[PDB]
Amino acid sequence: QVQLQESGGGLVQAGGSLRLSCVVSGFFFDTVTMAWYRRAPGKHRELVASATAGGTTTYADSVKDRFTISRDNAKNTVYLQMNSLKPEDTAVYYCNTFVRSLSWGQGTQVTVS
Amino acid sequence: TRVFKKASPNGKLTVYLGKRDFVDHIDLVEPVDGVVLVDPEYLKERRVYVTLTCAFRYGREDLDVLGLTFRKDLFVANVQSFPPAPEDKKPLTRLQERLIKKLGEHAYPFTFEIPPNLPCSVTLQPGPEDTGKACGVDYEVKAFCAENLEEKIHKRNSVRLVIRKVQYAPERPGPQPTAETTRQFLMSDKPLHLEASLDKEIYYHGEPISVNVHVTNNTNKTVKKIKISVRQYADICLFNTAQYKCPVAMEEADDTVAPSSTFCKVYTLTPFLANNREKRGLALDGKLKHEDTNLASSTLLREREILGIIVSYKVKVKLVVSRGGLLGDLASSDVAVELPFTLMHPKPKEEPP
Amino acid sequence: VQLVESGGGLVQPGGSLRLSCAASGFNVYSSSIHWVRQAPGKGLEWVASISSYYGYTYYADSVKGRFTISADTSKNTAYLQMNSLRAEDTAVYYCARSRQFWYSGLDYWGQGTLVTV
Amino acid sequence: SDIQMTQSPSSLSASVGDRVTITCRASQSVSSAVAWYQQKPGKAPKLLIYSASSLYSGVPSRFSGSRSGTDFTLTISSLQPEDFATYYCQQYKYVPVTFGQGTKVEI
Amino acid sequence: DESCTTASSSLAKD
Known part of the structure; x- marks a missing residue:
């Protein structure tokens, strides 16, 4: 079985902040990537990811300079900090990775007014 | 997509x-x-x-x-x-x-x-x-x-x-598969003429085959039994070459043709899988995992010799003829004919399987 | 090309009916035949399916043990034996056909027969 | 267990010329196995769409199908006077095949 | 000591 759960995320006002996290379930998480994707309303599903263990801070440059993308070992989770959130930042965020090519959860969801 | x-x-x-x-x-x-x-x-x-x-x-x-x-x-x-x-x-x-x-x-x-x-x-x-x-x-x-x-x-x-x-x-579609044969017996003067034809050359899997049968019995003898069979021929050329003839569907009508008379009847045969799960060696279309798949499509060749397994089909029509008389049971009395045809899937007009 | 149902009417609870589905213009070994019922004012519920090509039968959970679907391929006709009928089984029984190679929806339907229990 | 085919809305009203969108979400993943049927009252069902988006032969071109993940959309671009009926979805990737409750479109 | 099943992903239109 594979449990995945994006955690948090909801109503947010512009110029504020967020925090998200998700835990993989089952795998021996020794050597790994975290191939996060994220969606958009009625769109192709696209990549924003980083953070294997050992110093990986990588981005698709739409969302650089703002996201403390950060993994974890003992909890077996990996986080997402957000700042000053854009009408393009409003989306449906997944936490996939092609370790088992995880069928995703349901995605948290935000709003900018 | x-x-x-x-x-x-x-x-x-x-x-x-x-x-x-x-x-x-x-x-x-x-x-x-x-x-x-x-x-x-x-x-x-x-x-x-x-x-x-x-x-x-x-x-x-x-x-x-x-x-x-x-x-x-x-x-x-x-x-x-x-x-x-x-x-x-x-x-x-x-x-x-x-x-x-x-x-x-x-x-x-x-x-x-x-x-x-x-x-x-x-x-x-x-x-x-x-x-x-x-x-x-x-x-x-x-x-x-x-x-x-x-x-x-x-x-x-x-x-x-x-x-x-x-x-x-x-x-x-190719030309209509037809076949005839003429058996002249030693001690008999009139020959035994057997004619059979299929309605067309290309059939789909699970489609009826209409066998137009024309028997001209100019002999003194009587046709006792008509054996129809669809046989799938598979040639496997890897190390050596092997062949077998396996009947995958059949109907034996006891229709009898009296001397000095003609006969015309339409026979309908459908090769299918439901009554063939017990057999070994039958050729099937490739499986993705282990799901059931239909009878193998006809192999299309290029005029050289091809590696692997080449599949084909022929219809056999067999008359069982009575014995006795001068030569007893020494001489066999069977009459066969073979009819190659094409068994393939129609071209998908919309989407792949 | 035509699908025709038969053998419907009124029956007291606990009785039996035998449905016939005469097919014509197409075959039985290249088509799979299905029965789909519709309760008065309710939605569609699949109950039975037969693939003569593979010799397999499929049933809805509500009819397992009570309904038995068969087919006379020589007569181009399917049959559904229905025992232990209850009042909730009252519906219009449709005969439908699907392409065996391969399933592309139920493309021909019969006019259906009324069964009242 | 049985695949649940949540079809929504159960009923909707629109006028001649409106673009009608009938969604139907499957409780679990169904790949391309979606059909759309047209049944008129007292009549037998008519096949409209097969293999999620492939328009069946002889069916007017105003009908089209789409798939976004486990969401499926039946669109009637230019609503014609005879397209008022009950529309059913169908999953057919898992046995047993189960149908949706239906969406009756009325003027 | 195992293998994942063959799944199916998206592809945008153009």
Whole structure:
């Protein structure tokens, strides 16, 4: 079985902040990537990811300079900090990775007014 | 539209293909285009291979392990997707550039060309006590990560994907399969003339076959029984060449033709699977995993000799004739005729299976 | 090309009916035949399916053990034996056909027969 | 267990010329196995769409199908006077095949 | 010591 759960995320006002996290379930998480994707309303599903263990801070440059993308070992989770959130930042965020090519959860969801 | 994906157990590799069914035309093959996503966070090995393997899978007769097979290769082609090969310079398909647009720079295209005159995907029906792998001819795409080409590939560091080579019925129907035979007996002066024909040349799987039968009995004898049979002929040329004739459907009408009279009747036969699960060796269309598949489509050849398993069908019409008289039971009294025809799937007007 | 149902009417609870579905213009070994019922004012519920080509039968959970679907391929006709009928089984029983190679929806339907229990 | 085919809305009203969108979400993943049927009252069902988006032969071109993940959309671009009926979805990737409750479109 | 099943992902239109 594979449990995945994006955690948090909801109503947010512009110029504020967020925090998200998700835990993989089952795998021996020794050597790994975290191939996060994220969606958009009625769109192709696209990549924003980083953070294997050992110093990986990588981005698709739409969302650089703002996201403390950060993994974890003992909890077996990996986080997402957000700042000053854009009408393009409003989306449906997944936490996939092609370790088992995880069928995703349901995605948290935000709003900018 | 959609695409297929499959990941390795350890996640380092994810093979992408556009479709599983590849249409085999007369001489050209459709290209095998796809991409391989290699995650650079884990790549260091500096060489990723993808391998196309055409293998003959069979079970060993001396081993009592159900499903235990060995694969004899018939065609192997390799492409080094990462880094880009210094020699190989190939154009990308529109599908491929879309895949690159989706995944990003970490997606490396690969394109394999299957040469003509190779066997199509055929699965031999397993026996009652085998539940494992399926024997016959199958394709496999294996993409893996290694230091060089000699090393034995660990299965967790790999991904295999079954694909099928299929054929469809020709657009223009061929000439009507007809056959006649003339038996002149030694001690008899009038001959026995048997005529049979099919309504057309191309049939679909599960479609009725109409056998126009014309018997001209100018003899003194009487036709006692009419045996109709659809037999699938399979020629397997690998080490040696073998052949067998296996009846897959039949009806024996006891219709009798009296002397000095004519006969005309329409017989209808349908070859099907439901009454054939107990047989061994029957040819079936390639399986993806272990799901049931229909009777093997007719093999289309190119005029040379082709490796693998070549399938064909003929209709046999057999008259059982009475004996006695001068020569007793020494001389056989059977009369046969054979009628080749084409059994294939119609061209998909919309979407693949 | 025509599908025709038969053998409907009123029956007291606990009675039986036998449905016939005469097919014509197409075959039985290249088509799979299905029965789909519709309760008065309710939705569609699949109950039975037969693939003569593969010799397999499929049933809805509500009819397992009570309904038995068969086919006379020589007469191009399917049959559905229905025992232990209850009042909730009252519906219009449709005969439908699908392409065996391969399933592309139920493309021909009969006018249906009324069964009141 | 049984695949649940949540079809929504159960009923909707629109005028001649409106673009009608009938969604139907499957409780679990169904690949391309979606059909759309047209049944008129007292009449037998008519096949409209097969293999999620492939328009069946002889069916007017105003009908089209789409798939976004496990969501499926039946669109009637230019609503014609005879397209008022009950529309059913169908999954057919897993046995047993189960149908949706239906969406009755009325003027 | 295992293998994932063959799944099916998205591809945008153009």
